[PDB]
Design a protein around this ligand. Structure first.
Ligand SMILES: [Mg+2]
Ligand SMILES: [Mg+2]
Ligand SMILES: [Mg+2]
Ligand SMILES: [Mg+2]
Ligand SMILES: [Mg+2]
Ligand SMILES: [Mg+2]
Ligand SMILES: [Mg+2]
Ligand SMILES: [Mg+2]
Ligand SMILES: [Mg+2]
Ligand SMILES: [Mg+2]
Lengths: 170, 50, 205, 159, 293
RNA sequence: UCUUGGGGCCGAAACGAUCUCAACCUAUUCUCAAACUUUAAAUGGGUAAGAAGCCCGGCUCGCUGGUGUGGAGCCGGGCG
RNA sequence: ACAGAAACCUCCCGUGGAGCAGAAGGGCAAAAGCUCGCUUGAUCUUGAUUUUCAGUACGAAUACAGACCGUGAAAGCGGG
RNA sequence: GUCUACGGCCAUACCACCCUGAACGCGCCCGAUCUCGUCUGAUCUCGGAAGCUAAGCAGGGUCGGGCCUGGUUAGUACUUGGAUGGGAGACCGCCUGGGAAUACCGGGUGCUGUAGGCUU
C-alpha cells in the first residue's frame, strides 16, 4: 500500500503569452490572462536585444501568471479538453512536468470581446508530492531525495489515471 | 673569509692561522664546527695531547 | 634562412612558450609525431627502442622533423610500411628569438620569434619505435641513422617495457591473463582491486 | 625599475590558502589581545581593512594598544643598516597569538615548581637547558645473527 | 552527450561551507556582528537573546560566545507553559510573550536582581524600557538574535522580546515591529499590541469560525475544545500565566533515571566484516557463473 | 554515440535500413609554462630563551559594566 | 502555441567556470554580485600611525578620539 | 544509544545511490480571521494539529568518487658549504650537511562545548 504522502499533486500551473512586442497588444494579453485566471499577471522584459525578433533589452514582450490550488485544476481541465485529453510522449519533461500549447484562448470558454482579440498561450503543469517545499524554504532547506522525485513515466502514468488521457507516440 | 665563517672562527677564538683551542662537543658546537669546516682541522685529542 | 643550430644549442633562457604574451610565433617544422601503423594493438609490437638524450640542450623543430623522416624511411624499407609505429616524444614549445640587424644596435634588443625548439634533459627519450621482436636490429639501425640529425650525444636503448606501455615485458603477459591489464588500442588500461564491484563483475563475465 | 605600489608582489602572500576561502571563522574575532602580547602578523586578503604592509607579513611584535577592532603593534623593521621599532595598526584578523614564548612560560613554571620542590627536599635539580650531548657508550646485541652484508648494485641503464 | 560537471575534478576543487551553514541553521554574516565583542572590552561577555520558533515550540535562550562554543546562560521553552496554566497555542504570539517573560524572570531570579528590576508588571503593550537604578546592580542588557526569521511587523520574535523587556531585561528595540504599528501612518497603536499579547486575535478567530462554520471550528481548534479553552477566558488565562511566571520562574530539571543499555541503530562494520563481505560476493558471482554453464 | 553533420546506400520513404568518416561524450595515453598550479624543499627572514621575571595583598578610575565585572594604573610584600 | 541557433515560461544540475566602472593580480555566494526601500559618514574637528622615505614633503591609506547624522528591529555598520 | 536550540574547528563532516529509524523532538503537513507579503498564503508572515515518516534529518551500507592520513616514489629530484676534480663544451662525479612531489599500495570517514529533552 502506497504511503499517503507520496501521492502526486499539481504544484502550480504556469500560463505564459509571449506577445513578442510591447504596447497595446501586450496590455490586451494581460487582460486575457486575468479573465482566464482571475488574477493580475506580471510582465516580463527582454533579457537581450535581438535584431531579428525586433525586441530590445528591458522591453516588455510577454505576460505570465502562476495559478495554484483548486483554480489550477479548473483551468487545466479547459485546456486539456481543447486538446481532447491527448498529449505526446515528448510533451513530458524528465523532471516530472509537462505542458502544452493553446492557439486561441476563446476555445477555453472565454467570451470574445472586440477590444481584446485572439491570443494563444502556453500551459505548463508542475507536478509534485508533499514535502517538495523543503527546497523552497529559507530555514533548513534541503533536497527532496532520489526516491521522492517524479519520473517521466510517473508523470505520464498520473496523467492517464487523472484524466483518462492518451499518450500518443513520438 | 666569508662573513658567517669569520664570525664563527672569532667565537672559537681562532683568529690566526695554526691557532688552537679545545672545544667541548655538543649539538650547538658541532654545528658551529660544520660551518667552518674548510677553515679548520679538528678531532679528538688523547691524554698525551692535552 | 635561419641561423645555424649552434646559435641556439644550449638552454640559456627560461622556457618561452607560445602564449598570450609571446604572439606571432611561426609554426613548427614538425607537425606529425606518430607515423607507421599507429592503430596496431598493444600486443602486435612488444619491442620498443628509444633514442635517449645524453645532453641537456635544445633540439630545433627542424632536427625533429628531419630525424623523424630519416628514422621512418629506414623502417619502411626494412620492416614494411605496417611493421612498426614511431612516436616522436618531444614537442618544440620553447620559442627562440632573433634581434635582426641590417641601426639602433643593442638599443631595444629584445628579439622577435624566430622558431621553436624542444628542451631535452639528460636521460630523456627523444623518439621511440615499437615493432616486432625480430626487428630489433632494424630499430637500432633506424635510430642510429637518426642520431645524425641531432646535435650532441644520444644513446640507443632497447626498453624492457612492453611496447609503449609502462609495464615490464617480462610480466606483461601474466598481467593481461590475470586481467590487471586490458588492451585499449595502442596501450593498456590498468585495473586495480578498487572501486565498484560491478566493474569486477563486468570484467569477469 | 619597480613601482612603489602598496600591494606589489603580494599575489600569493595575501591570497587565501587552497579550499580555505569564504567566511572567516569567528574564533578569529574572539581571541583576547592584551598589552604586552606577542603576536605574529600574517595579512589576510579576505579583509582589506587594517591590512599590514607586506614588509610586516611574517614578523612578530608586541601589542601596545587595543582598540575596538585593531591593536597597535611594536614590530622591528630593518631598513639598510638600522633596525627601527615600528608601530603599526592592524586589525585582529591579520594577527595571531605567538607560541614562541609559551615554551618559555611552560619552562618557568616547571622551573619555579622544581626549584621550590627540590629546595624542601634539600636536593639539587638541573634547571638550565643543555645542548644535546654526545651519545654515551652502549652495547649492541647481535642475537646470534651476522649483520646483513651490503654491496653496491651494478649500473643499469633504465632509460 | 554533455560533460559531467560533477566529475572527479569538481570534487577535488570543491570547498564545503561551514556545517551550520550547510544545515541552513546559522547566518554567519549576522552572527559575526551579533556575538563579536570589541577588543578593548576583553572578556566582557556580549549576551544575546536567541528566539527560535519551531513548528510546535518556542525556544528562548540567553547566550554569550566563547571560543569553544556559545555558553547558554538561561533558557526558557514554551513547552513549559502548561506548568503555568497555558495548555494550547504554544507557538502563537501570546505564548511568545509568556516565554520571553519567563526567560527574563528566570534570569533575574538567578542573578538575584528580580526584586530590583520588576519590569512592567501590568502589561500595557506600549513602548517600555528598563532603566538602571543607581546604587543597585545594573540592568541586564542583551540583544535579540532573530536567526533567519523575516523580521517584519508582527513576527513572534518580537513577541518574545516584548515579554523579555516587560520582565526587566534591557534590550534595544523600537515599536516598529510590534503588532499594532501602522506602516501607512507610521503610528504605533499600543492597544492593538496588547490584544495580541493577550491572544485576542486568536479569540476573535474562534468566535468568527464558530459563527461561520462549526466544522471548520472543530478542525481549526480541536485541541482548544479538548482542553476547554474558550474565547472568553483566554485573556484571564494569559494574565494568570504572567502572575504565576512572576511568582516562581525557577526551573526544576527533570530527574534523570538510569536505563538499560539499548542501542537503536547499527554500528559501523569493521574492516574484516567489510572485507569478508566482498569475498563472499566474489565467490557468489563465480559460483553462479559456473552453475549456469 | 544520436545529440548533430559529411559521404555514401536500399528506396514510394520517414529517426526505417545500412554502413562509413568526422564532430560530441567517457576512461586512457605523449609532451609542456617567467607573467600556471593541488603539492613543495635547501639556503633564508621575524620572535622568544627571566628580576623590566614570577607569585601574593591592597588602592585609584570620569574608562568598561548583570556582578566588587573587565581593563589599565599605582602601593606594599615574598621569591636568585 | 506562433518560436526557429537565438524572444518568453517551467523544472533540474551548477564552487562561481558570472558580476563587482577600468589594466592586471588578490578578494568575494542567505555577499563584496543582482533587485528594491530609506538616505548623504563623499559632512564638521584635533592629534597618532602606515606606505615612498632622508624615516622630509606631497599623495594615498590605517586605527582611534570628539561632534553632528544615516540606516537597521537590533547587534552594528558608514566619515566615499 | 540518541535528539533539539545555540555553537567551535570547518568534507574523517562533502557527493551519489540503497536500507533502517523505538520515544521525545525536528519536520512534512492543515488553513488564511487576525499581523504581514505575494501575479500566485508556492515562498514570507500568522492560526493550527486530521494525517505521515514518503521526504528533509539521524544511523548504517558501497572491492563507491572525494576528502584525511600513512607507505612507496626515495635518500631519488633538488639543494648549503669545498677542491689547482673531470670534461673543448654541455654538463657530470665526489666531499660536508639538509632533503621533496606524482603515479602506484594501505588505513580512516567527524570530534566536541553550553543548555534542554527522550531512552528500566
Ligand atoms: Mg538517495
Ligand atoms: Mg638569456
Ligand atoms: Mg539580518
Ligand atoms: Mg545582503
Ligand atoms: Mg565618529
Ligand atoms: Mg514513530
Ligand atoms: Mg500552505
Ligand atoms: Mg525512510
Ligand atoms: Mg574511496
Ligand atoms: Mg556523527
Amino acid at each position: 500500500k502506497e504511503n499517503p504522502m507520496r501521492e502526486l499533486r499539481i504544484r502550480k500551473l504556469c500560463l505564459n503569452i509571449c506577445v513578442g512586442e510591447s504596447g497595446d497588444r501586450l496590455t490586451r494579453a494581460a487582460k486575457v490572462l486575468e479573465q482566464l485566471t482571475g488574477q493580475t499577471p506580471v510582465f516580463s522584459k527582454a533579457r537581450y536585444t535581438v535584431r531579428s525578433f525586433g525586441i530590445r533589452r528591458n522591453e516588455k514582450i510577454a505576460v505570465h501568471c502562476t495559478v495554484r490550488g483548486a483554480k489550477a485544476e479548473e483551468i487545466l481541465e479547459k485546456g486539456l479538453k481543447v486538446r481532447e485529453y491527448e498529449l505526446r510522449k515528448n510533451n513530458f519533461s524528465d523532471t516530472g512536468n509537462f505542458g502544452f500549447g493553446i492557439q486561441e484562448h476563446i476555445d477555453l470558454g472565454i467570451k470574445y470581446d472586440p477590444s481584446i482579440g485572439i491570443y494563444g498561450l502556453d500551459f505548463y503543469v508542475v507536478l509534485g508530492r508533499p514535502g517538495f517545499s523543503i527546497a523552497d524554504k529559507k530555514r533548513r532547506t534541503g533536497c527532496i531525495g532520489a526516491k521522492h522525485r517524479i519520473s517521466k513515466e510517473e508523470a505520464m502514468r498520473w496523467f492517464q489515471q487523472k484524466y483518462d488521457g492518451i499518450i500518443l507516440p513520438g | 673569509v666569508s662573513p658567517k665563517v669569520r664570525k664563527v672562527l672569532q667565537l672559537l677564538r681562532l683568529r690566526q692561522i695554526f691557532n688552537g683551542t679545545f672545544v667541548k662537543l655538543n649539538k650547538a658546537s658541532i654545528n658551529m664546527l660544520r660551518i667552518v669546516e674548510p677553515y679548520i682541522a679538528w678531532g679528538y685529542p688523547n691524554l698525551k695531547s692535552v | 634562412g635561419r641561423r645555424p643550430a649552434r646559435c641556439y644549442r644550449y638552454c640559456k633562457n627560461k622556457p618561452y612558450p607560445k602564449s598570450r604574451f609571446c604572439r606571432g610565433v611561426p609554426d613548427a617544422k614538425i607537425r606529425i609525431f606518430d607515423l607507421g601503423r599507429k592503430k596496431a594493438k598493444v600486443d602486435e609490437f612488444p619491442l620498443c627502442g628509444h633514442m635517449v638524450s645524453d645532453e641537456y640542450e635544445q633540439l630545433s623543430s627542424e632536427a625533429l622533423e628531419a630525424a623523424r623522416i630519416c628514422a621512418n624511411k629506414y623502417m619502411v624499407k626494412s620492416c614494411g610500411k605496417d611493421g612498426f609505429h614511431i612516436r616522436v616524444r618531444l614537442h618544440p614549445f620553447h620559442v627562440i628569438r632573433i634581434n635582426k640587424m641590417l641601426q639602433t644596435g643593442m638599443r631595444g634588443a629584445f628579439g622577435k620569434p624566430q622558431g621553436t625548439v624542444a628542451r631535452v634533459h639528460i636521460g630523456q627519450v627523444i623518439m621511440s619505435i615499437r615493432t616486432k621482436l625480430q626487428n630489433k636490429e632494424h630499430v637500432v639501425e633506424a635510430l642510429r641513422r637518426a642520431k645524425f640529425k641531432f646535435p650532441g650525444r644520444q644513446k640507443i636503448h632497447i626498453s624492457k617495457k612492453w611496447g609503449f606501455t609502462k609495464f615490464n615485458a617480462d610480466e606483461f603477459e601474466d598481467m593481461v591473463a590475470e586481467k590487471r591489464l586490458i588492451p585499449d588500442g595502442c596501450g593498456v588500461k590498468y585495473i586495480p582491486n578498487r572501486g565498484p564491484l560491478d566493474k569486477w563483475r563486468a570484467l569477469h563475465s | 625599475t619597480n613601482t612603489k605600489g602598496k600591494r606589489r608582489g603580494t599575489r600569493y602572500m595575501f591570497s587565501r590558502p587552497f579550499r580555505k576561502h569564504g567566511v572567516v571563522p569567528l574564533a578569529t574575532y574572539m581571541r583576547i589581545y592584551k598589552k604586552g602580547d606577542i603576536v605574529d602578523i600574517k595579512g589576510m586578503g579576505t579583509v582589506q581593512k587594517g591590512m599590514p604592509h607586506k614588509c610586516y607579513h611574517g614578523k612578530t611584535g608586541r601589542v601596545y594598544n587595543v582598540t575596538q577592532h585593531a591593536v597597535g603593534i611594536v614590530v622591528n623593521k630593518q631598513v639598510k643598516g638600522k633596525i627601527l621599532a615600528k608601530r603599526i595598526n592592524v586589525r585582529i584578523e591579520h594577527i595571531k597569538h605567538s607560541k614562541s614564548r609559551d615554551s618559555f612560560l611552560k619552562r618557568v613554571k616547571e622551573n619555579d615548581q622544581k626549584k621550590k620542590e627540590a629546595k624542601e627536599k634539600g636536593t639539587w635539580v638541573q634547571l638550565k637547558r643543555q645542548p644535546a650531548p654526545p651519545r654515551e657508550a652502549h652495547f649492541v646485541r647481535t642475537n646470534g645473527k651476522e649483520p646483513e652484508l651490503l654491496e653496491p648494485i651494478p649500473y643499469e641503464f633504465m632509460a | 552527450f554533455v560533460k559531467v560537471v560533477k566529475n572527479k575534478a569538481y570534487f577535488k576543487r570543491y570547498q564545503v561551507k561551514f556545517r551550520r551553514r550547510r544545515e541552513g541553521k546559522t547566518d554567519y554574516y549576522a552572527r559575526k556582528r551579533l556575538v563579536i565583542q570589541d577588543k578593548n572590552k576583553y572578556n566582557t561577555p556580549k549576551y544575546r537573546m536567541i528566539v527560535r520558533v519551531t513548528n510546535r515550540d518556542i525556544i528562548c535562550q540567553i547566550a554569550y560566545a566563547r571560543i569553544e562554543g556559545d555558553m547558554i546562560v538561561c533558557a526558557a521553552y514554551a513547552h513549559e507553559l502548561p506548568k503555568y496554566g497555558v495548555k494550547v497555542g504554544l507557538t502563537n504570539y501570546a505564548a511568545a510573550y509568556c516565554t520571553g517573560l519567563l526567560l527574563a524572570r528566570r534570569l533575574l531570579n538567578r542573578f538575584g536582581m528580580d526584586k530590583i528590576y520588576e519590569g512592567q508588571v501590568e502589561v500595557t503593550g506600549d513602548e517600555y524600557n528598563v532603566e538602571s537604578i543607581d546604587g543597585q546592580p545594573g540592568a541586564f542588557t542583551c540583544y535579540l538574535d532573530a536567526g533567519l526569521a523575516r523580521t517584519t511587523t508582527g513576527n513572534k520574535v518580537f513577541g518574545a522580546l516584548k515579554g523579555a523587556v516587560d520582565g526587566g531585561l534591557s534590550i534595544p528595540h523600537s515599536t516598529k515591529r510590534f503588532p499594532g504599528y501602522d506602516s501607512e501612518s507610521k503610528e504605533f497603536n499600543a492597544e492593538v499590541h496588547r490584544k495580541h499579547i493577550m491572544g485576542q486575535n486568536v479569540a476573535d478567530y474562534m468566535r468568527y469560525l464558530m459563527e461561520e462554520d462549526e466544522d471548520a471550528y472543530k478542525k481549526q481548534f480541536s485541541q482548544y475544545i479538548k482542553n476547554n479553552v474558550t474565547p472568553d477566558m483566554m485573556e484571564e488565562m494569559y494574565k494568570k500565566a504572567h502572575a504565576a511566571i512572576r511568582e516562581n520562574p525557577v526551573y526544576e530539571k527533570k530527574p534523570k533515571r538510569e536505563v538499560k543499555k539499548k542501542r537503536w541503530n547499527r554500528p559501523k562494520m569493521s574492516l574484516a566484516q567489510k572485507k569478508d563481505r566482498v569475498a563472499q560476493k566474489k565467490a557468489s558471482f563465480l559460483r553462479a557463473q559456473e552453475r549456469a554453464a
